[PDB]
Point group: D3
Chain length 242, copies 6
C-alpha cells in the first residue's frame, strides 16, 4: 500500500487522473457499475474504491464519507496516487421554495461552515469549483434533460444544528446558527450538504480541478430516480473532462 488509509497503490489506478467521489461507500458500486468493466479495489474504514473504464479510459470511484475530515484524507491520498480531477456526487436538502425534490444542483461555490477547509486556506479564500468541471456538469445536466439550478451551496460540518434543525435531542441551536437558514435563504443559497466546502477549498488551493453536483431528496420549506438522474450527470460530465 502506497497510502495510509485507502490501501491502494499507483499501479491499482492504472493511470487514472479523474475520480468520482460520492459520500456513501455503498453508492460506490452503483456508480462504477454504470461504466464499463467495474472492479473492486479496496474497502477500508469508510473508503470503498472501485475502478471502472469510461470511453476506454480508467476512472476511479472512491467514497469520502460524511464531512470534511475524511474527505480531506481521501482526496489527499488519491492525489498522492495521481488523481487530478475530482467530481463530487452528493445528496442534498434544498432551502429555496422554487427548487423541487428530484432537481439537480450544480455548485459554483460553497459557504464554508466547515473546519477542514481552514486547514488548507484561510476563510477569505473562496470555496470555488473548477470552471471546466462546472461547465461539464451543467452541459451534462442539459444533455439528459434534468431540472437544473446553478448557484451557491452551504456546506456544514454538522447535519442538525448547523442546518438549523430543531427536531433533536436538545432541541436547541447555538447562537451562531440561530436564524442562519433564513440568512442563507435570503442570500440565495440553494441547499445544504456536508462535503463540498472542504473538497473545493483544498482543490482550488492545491492546483486540482473539482466539481460538485447534488440531487435534491428533501426541501426544508415544504428518492430512487433522483439518484439515477444525478449519477448519470456525474458520469456524463466525467466523459467531457477526460
Amino acid at each position: 500500500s502506497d497510502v495510509f488509509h485507502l490501501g491502494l497503490t499507483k499501479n491499482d489506478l492504472q493511470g487514472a487522473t479523474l475520480a468520482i467521489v460520492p459520500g456513501d461507500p455503498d453508492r460506490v458500486e452503483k456508480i462504477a457499475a454504470l461504466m464499463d468493466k467495474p472492479v473492486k479495489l479496496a474497502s477500508h474504514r469508510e473508503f470503498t474504491t472501485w475502478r471502472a473504464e469510461l470511453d476506454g479510459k480508467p476512472v476511479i470511484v472512491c467514497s469520502t464519507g460524511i464531512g470534511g475530515p475524511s474527505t480531506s484524507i481521501a482526496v489527499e491520498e488519491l492525489a498522492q496516487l495521481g488523481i487530478r480531477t475530482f467530481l463530487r456526487i452528493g445528496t442534498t436538502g434544498a432551502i429555496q421554495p422554487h427548487i423541487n425534490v428530484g432537481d439537480v444542483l450544480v455548485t459554483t461555490a460553497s459557504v464554508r461552515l466547515d473546519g477542514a477547509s481552514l486547514h488548507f486556506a484561510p476563510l477569505e479564500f473562496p470555496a470555488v469549483a473548477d470552471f471546466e468541471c462546472t461547465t461539464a456538469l451543467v452541459e451534462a445536466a442539459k444533455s439528459i434533460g434534468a431540472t437544473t439550478h446553478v448557484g451557491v451551496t452551504a456546506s456544514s460540518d454538522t447535519f442538525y444544528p448547523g442546518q438549523e434543525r430543531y427536531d433533536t435531542y436538545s432541541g436547541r441551536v447555538v447562537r451562531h446558527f440561530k436564524g442562519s437558514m433564513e440568512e442563507w435563504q435570503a442570500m440565495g443559497v440553494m441547499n445544504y450538504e456536508m462535503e463540498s466546502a472542504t473538497l473545493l477549498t483544498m482543490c482550488a488551493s492545491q492546483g486540482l480541478r473539482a466539481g460538485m453536483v447534488a440531487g435534491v431528496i428533501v426541501n426544508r420549506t415544504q428518492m430512487k430516480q433522483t439518484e439515477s438522474h444525478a449519477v448519470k450527470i456525474v458520469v456524463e460530465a466525467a466523459r467531457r473532462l477526460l
Copy 2:
C-alpha cells in the same frame, strides 16, 4: 433631479437598461461607451461617471465605481435601485504567477476577500463567487477575439500597498497579518491582485444579481514593477473589447 443619493441618475435616464459595465476609473467610462452605438453622457458626481450606450438595439450602462469596495458598493446598490441586474466589471491588475504575462486577460471565478465591504453584505464564509452565465460569457468572448486568457481565483485587497505586500513605501513595513501573504496566495494558485472584485461579487451573489469580473494584466509582480505606457493602453483596449462582447451574450 435624482432618484439616488450619489450617482445623479433617474430610472428614466437608463431607458430600461438592465446591464452595466463597471470600470474603476471614471476616465475609462467614455472610452468603453464609444465602442457601442449611440453613446450619451448621463452624469458625473465624485468618482461616479455614467454613460448610456446601445448594444444590439438595447440600452446598456457604463458606470465607474472608483477604487475600492466602499464606492463600488454605493455604485452597485444605486444602479440596482434604478433597475440594473447584471454587472460586468472591467479593471486593471497585477499578476503574481510567472506563467501569466503583461497584456494577458484574466477572468475571475471567485475572489479572496481581503476587503471590508463584502462583510457588510455576507459573512466571511460566504464565497465571493462570480455568476456562472457571466463568467461563461467572458471566457467565450475572450476566445472569440483571440487573447491569452487565464481563469481562476483573484485576491481582492482593500489596499494597493501592504495588502498586496508592497515594501516600496513610506514606512517600508507590512503588518504581520499580510507578511508573507503573496507567497501564500501564489502557492494557492491565485492569479492576481485587484481592489474591487470581492465587494462586487459578494454583494451581487448574496442579492440575486449577476456579476462578472475581467481584468487586463499591466504588471507582473514576479518580473517587473514599472509598466510600459504603450503596452498599458493596448492591454486596456483588449480587455474592453472582451467585456463589451461578453455583454452582447448577456442581453
Copy 3:
C-alpha cells in the same frame, strides 16, 4: 428506523444507556465480540452498530467514522434513542518524546482544531470529558496494568496539514498550522486524533457523559510508519480498558 442515518429503533437498543464509540466500523465487530451475546443491528454508510451485553446489561457499539461531522450524527441519533453515556475508543499519534508506541492515553480535554464543535458551543467553551468517565478509564487502565498518560489531546479536522504533515501532494501547510506541532508540544499536548473535540464539546454542552481513550500506534518524534504487528496489540490493549471502564459506569 426512528433515526435518519443509523437505521435503528429505540427497541433495538433494549434500554441501553451506554455506548462505546470507535472510529473504524471494522473495529465494531472486534469490540462487541469481547462482551456477552454480540448481535449485529445495522450497517449504513460509516455507521455499523452492534448490540452486546455487559454484566447483565445491554451495551451499544457504534462507529462514528473519521472526523467530527459523522461523529456528530452518530452521537445525536444515539442520544435520541436513549444513550446518555459515550466512551470513545481511538487510535492516535503521540507528539511527546516520553510517550511510547503501545501506550494508552486518557483525554481530560481537547484542543478544538475542528469545525463541528462550534456548531454546539462557541470556541471559548472547553472540549472537556466527563469526570466520572475519565475516572473510570484511568481506573480501568490501572486495573489491567498499562503505561498510561492523562492530559490534553489535539483534535484535528484533518490528518495531514492540521497535524503538520509535510509528506503530502502539495508539500505545504497553511500559515495557521505552520509550527503548530511544536506549539502543542511545548504546551504539554499528548497527541493527535480526529474525533474527541466534537464528541467532548457536544456532550458537555448537552448534558451527556463522555470519555476518551486512545492507543498510541505512532510517535511523531522518532519512528516512521505504523508497524502492522504493533498496531494489533495496541488496539486490543486499549479495547480491554474501554470495556472495563464501561463496567464501572453502568
Copy 4:
C-alpha cells in the same frame, strides 16, 4: 510622476508637509480658494490635487474619494512626497438626537468598521487622531463660533448596510450589522462616515499626524433627506475650521 496614482512629483509640493484631504474631488478647488495663491496640480481618477499658500507656507489639498482603499492610496503617496500632517474634512450623518444639522464634529477616535485599517494595524490598535491636530481643530471651531461636538465616529466601508440603512434594493442588513446603529448610539458614538478609520489608523501607526473634522448634513434620528437650505452653509462652516486649524499646525 514620482508616485503611481496621484501624478505628482516632490517638486510640485514645494516643501509642503501639510495636506487637507476631502472626500469629494470637486470640493478641492473650493478649499484651496480660501487660501492664498491656489494652483491646480493634477487630476487622475478620484484624486484631484491643488497647491495653495497659508501664512507664506505651501499647503496641499488632495481628494481621497469615498472609502479607505482610495484613501490609503492618497495618504501613502502623499507621505512619499513629504506630507507629515493630514487633516480630513468630510461630510457625515449624525446618529445622536442632540446633534443638529449644521453642527461640526471633531473626531477623537473611530470605530473601525472598515477593511483598509486592518492592512496597517490589527483591530485592537485604536483609530485615534493626533492630539495636536484634534486640539487645533477644536480651538479653530471655537474661534468661528460653531456648534461643536467632540467624540467617537463610526467609520464604515459601506454607505447602506454598515450604516444600517434599509431603504435599499434588498431591504435587509446582514446579521453582523443588525441593530448596530442602536449599539453605537448607546455607546455615545456621534456619527457615520467612510474614511476616518483608515486615515487615523494608518497615520497613528506610521508616525504621521492626522485630524478629523466633519459637517452634519443629516441626522438619522429625525429625517433622511439632506436639507439644501443648510447644505451650503454646513460645508462652508467646516471648511473654514479645517483651514484655520491648518494655520495652527503649520
Copy 5:
C-alpha cells in the same frame, strides 16, 4: 542573603522553605484564615493584592497566596510563584450558581472553564481547553466526600467582568454589550454551573506550562433565586470551602 526574588510578590525562594504547593484564594483577606487552619502559620509578605502566608501541613511547608480578582493579577501570582518553586496550585473562590438545582452552600469543583477572559489567550489560543489537572480534581472531589458536602462537578464560566459579562443589568448604564446579551441563558442550557473570575486564566496557564491546577468554589448566590448574598451564609460557606481545599492539599503533598 535576599529580599525578593520576584517582581511583585515580595518573596524569596528561601522564604518558601521548599514548598511546591500553593493554595490560591482571590481575596487577600482570606489568606490568613486558610493558613490558620494549618500548623505554624507565618506571614511572609503583603504587596498590592498579593498577600502571602506560609504554613505547615503534615510536616510539609505549604503556601497561601492571593491572586486578586481577575486573570491579569492571577497570571502574575502564578508565574512568580512558579519562579519560586511552586508546581501545584489550588484555587478556592466564591461563585454565583446559574443552575436551578444548585443551592447556596453547595461546593463546586471545576473540570474546565468557559474562557470569557483575556489573559488565558496570552498563554494558549482560544481552542486550547481551560482544563483542570485530573489529580487536583480528584483530590478536591474526594476531599469534599471525606468531610461531607453537596458537590457538583462540571464546567465554570470564567469572566473578565463581574457585571456585563455575567449579564448584570442593575448597573450605571443598565446595558450589556451585544456579545454578552442573552449569554447567561446560553450557558445555562449548556450545563454551565456557575460564574467566577479567575479559573480560565489559572487553568489555561497551568495546563499549557506543565503546572498542576485545581479549582473549587463555594456558592453564596444562585442567580435564578437571588442577586444579593446573605452575610451569614457567606461565612459558613467559606468555612466549609476552606476545609475542603486544605484537605485536598493534604492528598497532593
Copy 6:
C-alpha cells in the same frame, strides 16, 4: 454601611465627589491622597482601598483598581454607581521606545486593546480612546509641574509577562500570537506597556464617562529590566503630582 458590592462605600462617604483618581496599587492610595488637603481613609476591601481628600475646597476620591481590567471594571462601575463621572488613572509603565527615559511621564490618547474586559463593554473595533478634556488637563498639568512628557498610544495588556513579550519566565516561551509583538508595537509608535488603561478607557468612552490616563516610566525595555530603587520614587512623585494638578483643572 455599603451601597455597592465590593468597595464598601455609601454615596454619603463621597460627600458629593464626582472625580476619582484611580491608581492600580492600594498601597499608593494614601500617598496620592496625602498630596491633597485633609486626607481620610474610607474603606479597604480586597484590592480596593479608598481615600477621600480635599482639593481647592472640593471633595476628591482616590481609589485603587488593582492590576488588570477585571478589578478595574468593578471599581469603576461601583464608583460610577456612587456618583463619580470623571476618572483619572495614575499608573506605572515600561516604555518600549528608545527616546523615552525613566522618570518621564506618558499621557495616553488611546490604547491597544490587549485585554479581555474591554470587550465586555464594546466590540474590538471600538477605540479605547481617552476623553479629550481629561487628556488636555493631563497635558496642561504636565507643563504646570515642568516634566518631560510624551503623548501617544499605549499597549494595555492582560498579562505582565508573555503579552509584554517577556521571556524571563518559568516556561521561557511566548504564545505565537505575542511572538514578535513588542517589535510590531515599537514600529507602530506605541510608547509603553501597562495593564489597566484599555479596560478603563473603553468602558468609560462607551458609557458617557470621562477618563484620562497618565503613567510614570520606571523602566525602559530597550535599556534595562530591573527598576531602580532610588529612581522609582522620583518618577512616581512627578506623575502623581500631574494627576492631582489635572484633577484641579477638571473640578
